[PDB]
Structure formats: C-alpha cells, structure tokens
C-alpha cells in the first residue's frame, strides 16, 4: 500500500538527530543543556522511528560524539559525562547535566550541540540515503 510504501521508505531511510530537534538552550553556571524535540505524532508523520530508539541512540551515541567534540576543542584551545535526563515517558525534552573544571576557557556550547546533533545518525543503511517515490501507475522507489 501507499501507507506500506511510505513505511518501507522511512525504514530504508536514514535520518540525523538534528532533523528532529527544535530550538535548544544550554544553561551556564554546573553545565546543563536541555533540548526540545517535536511532538510525537508530528514526529511520526515525517518519521515513524520510535521514542525508546531516540532514548537509546541519543544517550549512547550523542553523548559519545559530544564528548569527542568537547575534548577536541579542548585540545585546540589548550594551545566526564555526569547526568542524563530524558523525557522517558512523554519524550519531549532532553536534559544533560555536565560538570567541568572552572579553569577552562568558555565554550560556544550552542554551536557545539548543534554540530553534535547534526552529526549523529539514528539509523542509516551504510552508505545510502534519500529514498523517495516519483511517478505510468508504476509504484517505484528512487533512492540515492
């Protein structure tokens, strides 16, 4: 079905964590961030990947990547993951609480989280992306 076709499309499709995040604020002090996500059914229209999958992927992989980018900018400026709080029931905000030595130089955390979420993938068949459907009444899928 067209429903089944669109489903299968979304399945083979890849998507990045940034494609779901709304505006994000990071709170300074303690070093705490809270992300906004889009509403679950509006989340499952353009998608249909699941909430617990968001939890799993966000937590592990996004924390890893964020730590990578933080450490690397720390290495350039030279010249730990403390707390996680996801909206486990409603799935509509993602707080992460980080703690840092006070001696370090400031951080453009805004650009950092944006770079992070724009980098981590939720699910991607390796080396494929952008599956679409384009019409002779011949149901076909056209994938880059």
């Amino acid at each position: 079905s067209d429903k089944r076709a669109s489903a299968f499309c979304k399945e083979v499709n890849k998507l990045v964590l940034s494609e779901v995040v709304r505006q994000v604020r990071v709170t300074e002090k303690t070093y705490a961030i809270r992300l906004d996500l889009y509403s679950r059914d509006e989340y499952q229209d353009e998608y249909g990947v699941l909430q617990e999958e968001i939890e799993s992927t966000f937590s592990n992989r996004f924390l890893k990547i964020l730590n990578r980018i933080i450490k690397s900018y720390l290495a350039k400026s030279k010249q730990n993951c403390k707390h996680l709080d996801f909206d486990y029931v409603n799935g509509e905000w993602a707080t992460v609480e980080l703690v840092f030595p006070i001696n370090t130089e400031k951080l453009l955390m805004v650009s950092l989280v944006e770079k992070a979420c724009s980098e981590t993938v939720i699910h991607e068949i390796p080396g494929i992306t952008r599956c679409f459907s384009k019409p002779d009444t011949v149901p076909k899928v056209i994938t880059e």
């Binding site: 130089e105 400031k106 453009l108 805004v110």
Partner: protein, 49 residues
C-alpha cells in the same frame, strides 16, 4: 606579504583603553545579549592568555 595580528592586541595598543571600555563599546546595549557577550568574553580572555 600577509600578516595576521590579533584584533585585541591592536585594540589595546590603539588607545589607552580598559577592557571594560572594550566590552561596553562592543556590546553595550540590551545588557546581556547572549551571543555577543559570551563571544566577546572569549576574545578578551584569549588575548589575556
């Protein structure tokens, strides 16, 4: 030949100026505009280094 000297250097070298004068000239408005404030701070700090 190209030559790269930090802006903060030539700034404090231009006028006998206090860093507070820099900060209140650069973003002195709308006190605590997030982006401008944190970037300017980083700049003053990295020159102070």
């Amino acid at each position: 030949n190209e030559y790269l000297i930090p802006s903060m250097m030539i700034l404090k070298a231009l006028l006998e100026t206090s860093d507070k004068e820099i900060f209140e000239g650069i973003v002195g408005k709308d006190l605590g505009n997030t982006f401008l404030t944190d970037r300017v701070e980083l700049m003053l700090r990295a020159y102070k280094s």
